[PDB]
Design a protein around this ligand. Sequence first.
Ligand code: C2F
Ligand code: C2F
Ligand code: CA
Ligand code: CA
Lengths: 262, 262
Amino acid sequence: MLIIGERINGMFGDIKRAIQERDPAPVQEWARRQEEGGARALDLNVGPAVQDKVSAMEWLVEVTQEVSNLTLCLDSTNIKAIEAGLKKCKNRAMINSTNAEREKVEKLFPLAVEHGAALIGLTMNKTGIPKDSDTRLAFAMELVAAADEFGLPMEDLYIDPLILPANVAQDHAPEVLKTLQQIKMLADPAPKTVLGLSNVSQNCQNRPLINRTFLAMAMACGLDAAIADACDEALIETAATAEILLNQTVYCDSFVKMFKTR
Amino acid sequence: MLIIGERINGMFGDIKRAIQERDPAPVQEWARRQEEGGARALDLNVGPAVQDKVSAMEWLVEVTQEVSNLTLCLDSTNIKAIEAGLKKCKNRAMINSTNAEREKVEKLFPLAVEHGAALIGLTMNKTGIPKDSDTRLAFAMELVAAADEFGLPMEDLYIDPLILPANVAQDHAPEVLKTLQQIKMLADPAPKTVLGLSNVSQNCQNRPLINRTFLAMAMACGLDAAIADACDEALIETAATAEILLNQTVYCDSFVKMFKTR
Ligand SMILES: CN1c2c(nc(N)[nH]c2=O)NC[C@@H]1CNc1ccc(C(=O)N[C@@H](CCC(=O)O)C(=O)O)cc1
Ligand SMILES: CN1c2c(nc(N)[nH]c2=O)NC[C@@H]1CNc1ccc(C(=O)N[C@@H](CCC(=O)O)C(=O)O)cc1
Ligand SMILES: [Ca+2]
Ligand SMILES: [Ca+2]
């Protein structure tokens, strides 16, 4: 399980301010804390508030890689910002993300291949987020075909079935799990999967509990990565424990500590 | 998710003592504690120490139902002990258990049907516990077939893939999850599934964490019941949260208390 730190996101007050005033401190500290927690990748989202998002993404990348060697997951719907971000990265990055819209596919897949970056693909298009796991799957298969079309190593494709809040879109959770299990059955080389975990507990009571439980359930269905709270110690324990239970990582008494220091 | 309290088991020092000295107190206190924790069924095992195991089972049933209206899960390999127990039960019971051995099947299935009791079926026979999910599923199918043969309503059949310790039999864990998943894809009305959860963490470190993480994973694979620690609050939290994430129970802020006081 690859945990992608979610905290360096412009939606958070401290990050929004850091970006606006160009204060590196808050960002670099979150990069450190998330890595200490067990994250092996960092999501970088500039947020919708800043004016020049292209310039903001470059800044997030520069100040982050100064204190971290972790993989950078450039999170933005602005392709110019993604491209500008990729050019600043000193290490392999992740593009977050592309959807099944052909227009975006033929721009982001070649871009990912060009930079040898991983690519996250959302199971949806202009038509919206589908509920049925079969519709989600069809979009997943469109991304898979695209990976073969543009020469992207299937192992560099992370399909995101898009999890929603369990309190107002509860019937989506089981559909997401089913979509993951289906993608898991694909023949080798099979694509990977990822989720914006925290979205499942938005506005719910005891979000950490809900996040933890869904992560474990999702991993049983093949989940490979999760954009989540890397500073949540109980979440990290779950990830570590789940690997053991799927026999992905050999058991030893200090399996949690080994997960955080691998 | 049906939690079957595991604590009333002769392997535990206090229960062994209570049975041998015929002291109702310890047993009745555990019955109340487990129900308060959220269990809706109580496993009753006399343990191997006591000499007269048939009268010990009748005694456990008598002292337990005296303070509890919960379904009693009679845990014993001695058919006579099971029969004497069922005869003492004032409420519907559960038999734990029968295996895939035909000799066991033709005695236990008709027994469960005669008493209108539920029946737990282990995916194993005299050749042992199979590691591969293919063979586990094969025995599961024999159990489903026997249920139709002897007239046991399918929802009264709980198939147990038999989970083993994650530190010495780690490769069994994923095979169990796969079995559960395939069991749910046999035919509706499909049979139910159950596990002796605590076995997965035997001799491991961070036992509660391993137990609850696996429960969540198993529920995503269809687990319907579990013989576990009904007094472990974190375990109950997971059970309650999993139901929500599988859309089996409508979400509300008090979903945990709601599960317990259900
Ligand atoms: C849509 N999510 C998502 C994605 N990328 C992919 N591929 N998939 C996804 O589902 N990128 C962004 C987001 C994942 N990251 C996050 C980050 C924070 C919170 C969150 O819970 N935020 C707080 C905001 C706190 C504050 O603003 O002060 C919240 O309560 O909403 C949720 C998801
Ligand atoms: C084999 N398990 C099992 C079953 N029935 C079915 N159908 N399936 C099962 O897997 N019945 C008994 C047991 C389930 N109950 C239990 C009860 C306790 C412990 C346990 O962890 N015991 C302690 C012993 C503690 C003591 O002796 O004081 C241990 O660490 O082994 C595990 C499973
Ligand atoms: Ca996978
Ligand atoms: Ca089920």
